Design a protein around this ligand. Sequence first.
Ligand SMILES: NC(=O)c1ccc[n+]([C@@H]2O[C@H](COP(=O)([O-])OP(=O)(O)OC[C@H]3O[C@@H](n4cnc5c(N)ncnc54)[C@H](O)[C@@H]3O)[C@@H](O)[C@H]2O)c1
Length: 160
Amino acid sequence: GASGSMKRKVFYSFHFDNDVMRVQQIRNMGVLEGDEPVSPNTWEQIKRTEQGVKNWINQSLNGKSCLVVLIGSQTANRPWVKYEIERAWKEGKAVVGIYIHRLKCPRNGYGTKGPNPFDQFTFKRGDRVIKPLVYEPNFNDAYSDIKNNLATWIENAIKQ
Ligand SMILES: NC(=O)c1ccc[n+]([C@@H]2O[C@H](COP(=O)([O-])OP(=O)(O)OC[C@H]3O[C@@H](n4cnc5c(N)ncnc54)[C@H](O)[C@@H]3O)[C@@H](O)[C@H]2O)c1
């Protein structure tokens, strides 16, 4: 029989102006099925109102079992990243973080390691306190380390 592929659909949460090209490398690995971004002009239209942004986030997260935060230098302070993490967690979805400063951006090279966005918050499910999982790729050749382990990392978050 012809072999098939089955990839988990995910929502990527990240700081665009610093990390969009690093996240592209993860898309290129072909391991997860993340939604592609809307165009810049479409994003500007969405951003005209807070309700529009929330509608877009809520709709994009709806059919996703896992939110994947790609952690760069400023991700922890992005207000819509906070909203996305909160929405995914409140909706019972998996939440996981991956540091991406060791992915080499064609423009900015290697990045500054940023704070863990999740550490600013206390997460609970059913009165248990949980810390979302965060993975730190190998300092040298982070691309290959991520590619080899990303699918498992997301399944670990799903089972949490
Ligand atoms: N186009 C998109 O899909 C898009 C863009 C930005 C943010 N977001 C959502 O908001 C969250 C927070 O991100 P943020 O804090 O960077 O938001 P933000 O609203 O602060 O980002 C605005 C910036 O996004 C850039 N941008 C928009 N569309 C882009 C694209 N297609 N490719 C490259 N750059 C693009 C613009 O340069 C702009 O400066 C993200 O996790 C994501 O869910 C989505």
